[PDB]
Amino acid sequence: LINCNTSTCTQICPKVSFDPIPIHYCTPAGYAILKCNNKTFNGTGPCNNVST
Amino acid sequence: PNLWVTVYYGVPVWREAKTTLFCASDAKAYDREVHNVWATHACVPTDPNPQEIVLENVTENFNMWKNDMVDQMHEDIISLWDQSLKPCVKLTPLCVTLECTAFNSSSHTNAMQEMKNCSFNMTTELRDKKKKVSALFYKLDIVPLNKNGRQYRLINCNTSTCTQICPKVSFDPIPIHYCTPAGYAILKCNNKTFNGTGPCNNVSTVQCTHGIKPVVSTQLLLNGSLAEEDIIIRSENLTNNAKTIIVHLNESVEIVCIRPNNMTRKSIRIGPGQTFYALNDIIGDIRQPHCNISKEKWNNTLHRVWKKLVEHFPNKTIIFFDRHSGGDLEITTHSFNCGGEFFYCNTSGLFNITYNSNTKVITLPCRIKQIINMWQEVGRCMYAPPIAGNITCTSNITGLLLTRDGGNNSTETETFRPGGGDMRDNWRSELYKYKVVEIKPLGIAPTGCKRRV
Amino acid sequence: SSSHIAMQEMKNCSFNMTTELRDKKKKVSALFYKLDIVPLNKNGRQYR
Amino acid sequence: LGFLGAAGSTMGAASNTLTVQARQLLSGQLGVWGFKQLQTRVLAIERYLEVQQLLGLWGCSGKLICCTAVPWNSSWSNKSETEIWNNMTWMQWDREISNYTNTIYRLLEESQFQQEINEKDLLALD
Amino acid sequence: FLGFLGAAGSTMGAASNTLTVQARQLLSLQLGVWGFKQLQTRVLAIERYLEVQQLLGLWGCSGKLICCTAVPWNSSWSNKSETEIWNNMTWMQWDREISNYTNTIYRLLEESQFQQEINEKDLLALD
Amino acid sequence: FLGFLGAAGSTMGAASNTLTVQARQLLSLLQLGVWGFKQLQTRVLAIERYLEVQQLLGLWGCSGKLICCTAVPWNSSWSNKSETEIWNNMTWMQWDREISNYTNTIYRLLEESQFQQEINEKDLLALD
Ligand SMILES: *[C@@H]1O[C@H](CO)[C@@H](O[C@@H]2O[C@H](CO)[C@@H](O[C@@H]3O[C@H](CO[C@H]4O[C@H](CO)[C@@H](O)[C@H](O)[C@@H]4O)[C@@H](O)[C@H](O[C@H]4O[C@H](CO)[C@@H](O)[C@H](O)[C@@H]4O[C@H]4O[C@H](CO)[C@@H](O)[C@H](O)[C@@H]4O)[C@@H]3O)[C@H](O)[C@H]2NC(C)=O)[C@H](O)[C@H]1NC(C)=O
Ligand SMILES: *[C@@H]1O[C@H](CO)[C@@H](O[C@@H]2O[C@H](CO)[C@@H](O[C@@H]3O[C@H](CO[C@H]4O[C@H](CO)[C@@H](O)[C@H](O)[C@@H]4O)[C@@H](O)[C@H](O[C@H]4O[C@H](CO)[C@@H](O)[C@H](O)[C@@H]4O)[C@@H]3O)[C@H](O)[C@H]2NC(C)=O)[C@H](O)[C@H]1NC(C)=O
Ligand SMILES: *[C@@H]1O[C@H](CO)[C@@H](O[C@@H]2O[C@H](CO)[C@@H](O[C@@H]3O[C@H](CO)[C@@H](O)[C@H](O[C@H]4O[C@H](CO)[C@@H](O)[C@H](O)[C@@H]4O)[C@@H]3O)[C@H](O)[C@H]2NC(C)=O)[C@H](O)[C@H]1NC(C)=O
Ligand SMILES: *[C@@H]1O[C@H](CO)[C@@H](O[C@@H]2O[C@H](CO)[C@@H](O[C@@H]3O[C@H](CO)[C@@H](O)[C@H](O[C@H]4O[C@H](CO)[C@@H](O)[C@H](O)[C@@H]4O)[C@@H]3O)[C@H](O)[C@H]2NC(C)=O)[C@H](O)[C@H]1NC(C)=O
Ligand SMILES: *[C@@H]1O[C@H](CO)[C@@H](O[C@@H]2O[C@H](CO)[C@@H](O[C@@H]3O[C@H](CO)[C@@H](O)[C@H](O)[C@@H]3O)[C@H](O)[C@H]2NC(C)=O)[C@H](O)[C@H]1NC(C)=O
Ligand SMILES: *[C@@H]1O[C@H](CO)[C@@H](O[C@@H]2O[C@H](CO)[C@@H](O[C@@H]3O[C@H](CO)[C@@H](O)[C@H](O)[C@@H]3O)[C@H](O)[C@H]2NC(C)=O)[C@H](O)[C@H]1NC(C)=O
Ligand SMILES: *[C@@H]1O[C@H](CO)[C@@H](O[C@@H]2O[C@H](CO)[C@@H](O[C@@H]3O[C@H](CO)[C@@H](O)[C@H](O)[C@@H]3O)[C@H](O)[C@H]2NC(C)=O)[C@H](O)[C@H]1NC(C)=O
Ligand SMILES: *[C@@H]1O[C@H](CO)[C@@H](O[C@@H]2O[C@H](CO)[C@@H](O[C@@H]3O[C@H](CO)[C@@H](O)[C@H](O)[C@@H]3O)[C@H](O)[C@H]2NC(C)=O)[C@H](O)[C@H]1NC(C)=O
Ligand SMILES: *[C@@H]1O[C@H](CO)[C@@H](O[C@@H]2O[C@H](CO)[C@@H](O[C@@H]3O[C@H](CO)[C@@H](O)[C@H](O)[C@@H]3O)[C@H](O)[C@H]2NC(C)=O)[C@H](O)[C@H]1NC(C)=O
Ligand SMILES: *[C@@H]1O[C@H](CO)[C@@H](O[C@@H]2O[C@H](CO)[C@@H](O)[C@H](O)[C@H]2NC(C)=O)[C@H](O)[C@H]1NC(C)=O
Ligand SMILES: *[C@@H]1O[C@H](CO)[C@@H](O[C@@H]2O[C@H](CO)[C@@H](O)[C@H](O)[C@H]2NC(C)=O)[C@H](O)[C@H]1NC(C)=O
Ligand SMILES: *[C@@H]1O[C@H](CO)[C@@H](O[C@@H]2O[C@H](CO)[C@@H](O)[C@H](O)[C@H]2NC(C)=O)[C@H](O)[C@H]1NC(C)=O
Ligand SMILES: *[C@@H]1O[C@H](CO)[C@@H](O[C@@H]2O[C@H](CO)[C@@H](O)[C@H](O)[C@H]2NC(C)=O)[C@H](O)[C@H]1NC(C)=O
Ligand SMILES: *[C@@H]1O[C@H](CO)[C@@H](O[C@@H]2O[C@H](CO)[C@@H](O)[C@H](O)[C@H]2NC(C)=O)[C@H](O)[C@H]1NC(C)=O
Ligand SMILES: *[C@@H]1O[C@H](CO)[C@@H](O)[C@H](O)[C@H]1NC(C)=O
Ligand SMILES: *[C@@H]1O[C@H](CO)[C@@H](O)[C@H](O)[C@H]1NC(C)=O
Ligand SMILES: *[C@@H]1O[C@H](CO)[C@@H](O)[C@H](O)[C@H]1NC(C)=O
Ligand SMILES: *[C@@H]1O[C@H](CO)[C@@H](O)[C@H](O)[C@H]1NC(C)=O
Ligand SMILES: *[C@@H]1O[C@H](CO)[C@@H](O)[C@H](O)[C@H]1NC(C)=O
Structure with missing residues (x-):
């Protein structure tokens, strides 16, 4: 096996599913998330349209 | 005339209590060096200019021997070691029969009996194949299997499975400060001549203790704090022979320990991604490791200790002996950790001096070990990997640990043997001036004020 | 060994096991209840 | 300080x-x-x-300093205000009144509850 | 004592x-x-x-254990007289009866307190 | 409703x-x-x-109390801006940006004012 001089492989549990399901990240109390709604935002710099 | 109860929040009153403290280390310890057992970014940065508030006209009772924050420190140190040794390689495959022979180098032909050349079969990455590997082992870490003297085994194979200390992780002690949570305070006894118990006239308060290096050693406290005025002898009960005597020196005695051999390391693949670092041949001429102590300084220090001991033991002859050479190496020799290698030095030449009422250097022969069963716990062993090149350390002897022998029928003479178990005494010698108190800010006192209806 | 339920309830058993060193097997023996051992083959000599 | x-x-x-x-x-x-x-x-x-x-x-x-309507029982401490207030310290007072703390706490709770009921009734009358 | x-x-x-x-x-632990x-x-x-x-x-x-507020009671929430409320039922039964309008009353209490707060603020600013 | x-x-x-x-x-649960x-x-x-x-x-x-008026006088050193413009022209962020230097001193001043008020109130009640 290709892994046997590197590390011990672990079989994925056959009954365990791992297809990507949607996940939302939520801040605790006292913190807020700012979402930039500027449709032409390039990911850096100021953002005119902001939401919480 | 008619007084009424009044409630004050923030009253400066306290009470003895036991709590849990957290660690704080110097900010310099966070500069990379994640490879560290004690303070691998798991301690909050130390508060600059620590605030010590001197409490006036206050007398408090301390007790170094019934003190908390020492057992907790011991537990924290043990847990830190276990956590740092969790990801390290477990030497389960190494418990195998070794074919050991006394290795014979060119210099050996010219203390070469301290090591043996052991060859054994080691399982490769494939479970159905074995490879005859070789390594060099100290004679202190192998025991014979038969009486034929050909086949040996690692000393720990009947006790537990040693864990190779991760070569990257550095167990060099660094100053650790102990801090109480909110609502608690530390009372520091500033009385310079405080003997460890009883009332303390000069008391102050702090949030974090001073930098305490968690140095583990026997028979000699290393890299510790020093007394301010005179040597202080501390014991829970001097007339009790079973209580170890902690001697605190106001002047440090420099000790220089060296391992001058040029060892070579080799890697043995014992599994998938598992490497075991062993000892190869020795390069160049061999010289026994040893420690150096100035003879005049140590003689003066031992004379002062003898004077204090005869002060505490008026009508008796105070004589210093060496610990019997039949017990465990941890208790019969001054053991410590220098540069990643564990030394066990014979201090028979230190406490060999006797005193009457009327440039030379002491050299202590030391022996290195690789399989270390610390904390005096059977079942918790490790393997310290070899370190290439020579190793040198320069520690400060800031204290001693003595033990008065049992009073024999032939009285009028007391013999003090260095050593004494209960490794917590190393921490106790540092946390003698600290106690933990719980603040009780709510107070009620009569006053001539009545709340409006 | 019974004087004579509790006669057949137990079995002598001899086997090999690893020692403290994982390269040598030592022949040991013990007494096992017949409720803890299952025959391997049909000849009634090897159990597990 | x-x-x-x-x-x-x-x-x-x-x-x-x-x-x-x-x-x-x-x-x-x-x-x-x-x-x-x-x-x-x-x-x-x-x-x-x-x-x-x-x-x-x-x-x-x-409130850090709060006067209450509970009368100061002389049985708790017969010493007058000025001696305890300009002679002793908080630790000494705590060790003296350590026996009677629970009684004073209970009395304070009852006094506050009674004041609250009285204020509610007084507002109800208006 | 109970x-x-x-x-x-x-x-x-x-x-x-x-x-x-x-x-x-x-x-x-x-x-x-x-x-x-x-x-x-x-x-x-x-x-x-x-x-x-x-x-x-x-x-x-x-x-405050008992706190009077300025929110006026609404007969829609309950139209029983005070005497039978306070001498007939228990707290469990009243809570069961009122659970429909609890959030509305909570919101009204918050708004009333904030209104009183800014009233007091501007009143003190007047002086 | 906002x-x-x-x-x-x-x-x-x-x-x-x-x-x-x-x-x-x-x-x-966790x-x-x-x-x-x-x-x-x-x-x-x-x-x-x-x-x-x-x-x-x-x-x-x-x-x-969400909004609380205190007895600490407002130093002109911290800010000299007029009132109608500071309350009808500035947002909270800009204000915080200006006063980020002097917040701590104002915190201590507010606390000392409150403690002194408490001491004087206790003394006045004791006088009666
Ligand atoms: C009581 O207190 C004394 C004083 O603190 C203490 O001695 C000190 O011991 C430490 C730990 O051994 C010493 O630090 C080591 O020293 C050497 C040499 O470096 C020194 O000198 C150079 C030149 O000035 C300085 O740049 C340097 O800062 C030191 O002063 C090295 O062996 C060590 O570096 C290696 O080990 C570190 C582990 O902490 C690693 O972080 C570091 O990266 C190095 O490891 C790497 O290189 C190795 C060599 O190639 C290699 O084998 C490793 O795998 C890895 O790649 C380290 O700096 C310190 O100097 C001592 N101080 C004095 C004054 O002597 C005593 O030990 C103490 N007593 C007891 C009983 O605890
Ligand atoms: C615990 O572990 C030990 C050590 O491994 C086991 O002991 C071994 O058991 C096996 C199986 O019983 C023994 O093998 C038997 O040995 C006997 C002698 O055979 C040898 O010599 C003949 C030539 O005369 C060779 O052909 C043979 O290979 C051996 O070298 C015989 O009883 C058996 O061989 C005869 O029977 C078999 C089939 O039954 C035929 O194939 C053979 O040709 C021949 O007719 C058999 O070989 C072995 O010797 C034992 N080892 C030792 C060191 O004594 C234990 O069994 C094991 N378990 C327990 C529960 O103790
Ligand atoms: C501790 O003992 C081990 C053995 O238990 C020993 O390791 C051995 O080293 C020798 C020499 O390096 C290895 O020899 C190998 O095998 C054959 C032997 O003839 C040769 O192909 C090679 O030997 C070379 O060097 C010889 C000189 O020593 C020459 O005569 C020869 O022509 C070759 O150039 C090759 O190295 C031997 O296999 C190992 N054994 C094991 C099990 O690895 C080790 O040196 C000892 N350590 C000390 C410090 O004494
Ligand atoms: C630290 O080092 C010291 C020495 O610096 C060391 O003590 C030495 O112990 C060895 C043994 O380990 C002693 O050597 C011999 O030991 C045995 C004891 O049974 C005997 O062979 C000898 O004792 C005889 O002594 C007389 C010989 O003239 C006889 O008359 C007598 O009957 C005995 O049979 C001999 O002692 C060695 O003497 C001591 N050295 C000293 C100075 O005491 C010590 O063990 C080391 N400590 C540790 C922890 O390693
Ligand atoms: C700034 O960002 C906000 C937030 O993303 C934008 O508001 C969003 O505007 C869109 C388009 O009008 C809204 O979608 C519409 O909403 C309703 C149903 O929800 C309906 O009219 C349509 O079917 C359509 O889906 C969206 O809901 C709205 N988001 C929010 C949170 O109100 C806003 O338009 C952006 N401003 C500028 C100038 O780009
Ligand atoms: C009671 O204990 C306190 C606390 O340890 C002692 O106060 C300490 O006094 C020493 C000696 O004066 C101070 O050290 C010196 O202080 C100044 C600078 O602060 C300077 O003269 C020197 O450089 C030196 O550092 C120390 O700072 C001071 N500690 C504190 C926390 O105030 C006090 O002297 C003791 N009293 C008695 C009667 O023993
Ligand atoms: C450290 O110093 C303290 C004092 O600051 C020493 O405590 C003293 O201990 C002695 C005995 O060693 C006590 O004397 C005995 O006390 C009782 C009551 O009288 C009784 O057992 C005997 O009759 C005898 O008198 C002494 O009272 C005690 N002092 C105080 C203030 O508690 C302590 O022993 C010293 N420790 C060391 C290791 O030197
Ligand atoms: C410090 O250690 C010494 C030595 O162990 C303690 O003195 C010992 O105290 C015990 C009792 O705690 C004594 O046993 C009793 O003694 C008499 C007869 O001798 C009698 O009351 C009882 O039958 C019992 O045997 C013991 O003799 C005594 N030993 C010596 C050598 O004095 C001492 O109490 C310890 N100090 C503290 C403060 O704990
Ligand atoms: C073993 O003990 C010696 C002697 O007490 C220690 O050396 C002393 O270390 C202190 C702390 O670093 C030095 O004080 C500092 O020195 C310089 C100025 O000289 C400066 O960093 C600070 O202002 C402070 O004064 C002290 O001078 C030094 N004494 C001597 C004689 O060298 C040593 O650190 C101890 N530990 C070892 C060797 O591991
Ligand atoms: C989203 O943000 C971008 C980037 O700031 C805005 O693009 C600007 O558009 C104006 C008007 O055309 C130009 O003058 C600027 O030069 C543009 N900026 C850059 C960096 O290119 C864009 O207008 C924003 N979108 C909305 C809807 O407000
Ligand atoms: C530190 O504490 C010691 C021990 O209590 C004090 O020593 C006392 O000193 C007085 C005055 O000379 C003597 O009367 C006592 O008998 C001493 N006690 C003992 C047990 O010997 C010392 O004074 C304290 N020092 C400071 C600076 O507070
Ligand atoms: C160790 O130091 C002691 C004193 O600390 C030295 O012994 C003393 O030497 C002085 C000076 O000659 C004499 O007055 C004393 O009577 C001596 N005391 C004793 C008990 O002999 C001693 O010489 C030093 N060296 C050694 C090896 O002990
Ligand atoms: C349980 O119910 C009984 C019966 O109603 C209560 O006893 C009554 O108490 C009131 C108030 O003091 C009196 O007026 C009645 O005369 C009592 N009735 C009887 C039959 O004794 C009792 O107090 C209730 N207990 C609790 C804990 O609520
Ligand atoms: C008492 O509660 C009722 C019921 O919620 C309120 O009636 C509502 O009044 C608003 C405002 O006119 C209407 O939009 C709703 O449709 C009504 N609800 C229903 C169910 O009819 C009434 O306003 C409340 N009275 C007071 C004084 O607060
Ligand atoms: C301690 O007592 C002395 C003498 O009465 C007094 O002057 C001093 O102010 C006291 N200190 C404190 C902190 O109460
Ligand atoms: C090493 O081997 C040589 C050559 O066989 C021998 O003479 C010498 O005694 C040996 N040295 C030892 C065993 O220390
Ligand atoms: C040890 O030997 C190696 C060669 O094996 C050499 O490069 C190295 O410098 C030596 N180390 C010391 C400390 O002398
Ligand atoms: C004071 O305490 C005593 C003892 O509990 C109690 O009987 C008495 O009623 C109390 N008196 C006052 C005036 O509070
Ligand atoms: C945003 O600014 C515009 C232009 O000054 C103003 O009309 C509007 O009310 C502002 N919006 C908010 C939510 O303050």
């Missing part, structure tokens, strides 16, 4: 610096250090909350 | 005289199962206590 | 009318592994933040 700086001072001097104690009452990573930090933080939070709950139950909520 | 929750079967007015015991009782269990139970109890205290502070009733 | 942080870009006067939603939102420990650590941190703010408000004498 710093935290607990008036520990050895008299009552009147110490009562002028309750604020530093009050503020230090709430001063302010899986493994052992993180777990211990979290456990100690929870315990400190608990102590602070019990103290605040007691102060609220006594009607002294949000 | 114990914790001892006035559960008593009428409203009779049970209103034992709030201190319940209020006091609201805030009465290692990595093992029980150390962790005590840990999350204590954290959760702290969270609930803080939530209730926050509600009381938002209503202006902070630190 | 939502949480709805008046972030509004002026101070308009934003001060919606403090209830923010105050409510400031304090709006396995034994790393994940649950981290989540409950965040819970503890939020509790500490809430308690710290509440303690500061109580020390200033404004416990239980």
